[PDB]
Amino acid sequence: MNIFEMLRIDEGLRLKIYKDTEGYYTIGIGHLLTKSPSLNAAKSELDKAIGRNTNGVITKDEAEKLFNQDVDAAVRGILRNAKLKPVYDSLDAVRRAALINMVFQMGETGVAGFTNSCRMLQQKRWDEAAVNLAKSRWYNQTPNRAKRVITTFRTGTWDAYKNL
């Protein structure tokens, strides 16, 4: 298991524009196109992202290319955030993947709260952090996924993704 396999499990793979859990146009492996209600706006974002006139459908290779860019972007976003970098640096590789997973799903920029959760992770109070992370819109809206990510933070193992 690694961050790519983990997110692939959590995000799925769809080659045609579809709506994510929040109702937003998305494609590939969790690649958010726009929060705009306009499908045309979403298709324009897609064409720009891929570099060709697609009309809503991409190939698996193209989906994996956006995925590589998105994971890279989540990692660089973490390292450029003065608040997240110290937490990421304090974690082992498995928990670092859990943090990348959260950033991939909700972004670094524009994310409200979680200051206390991050403080508990940096303190390595795994059980307390796990409880705290669950008191969130994030957990309530996508509980099965949040549970897997939280279990990863609580245990530092891939148990939530094995046999899954």
Ligand SMILES: *SCC1=CC(C)(C)N(O)C1(C)C
């Ligand atoms: S460690 C929890 C956390 C803090 C903040 C910077 C708000 N984030 O985006 C996540 C959800 C990673």
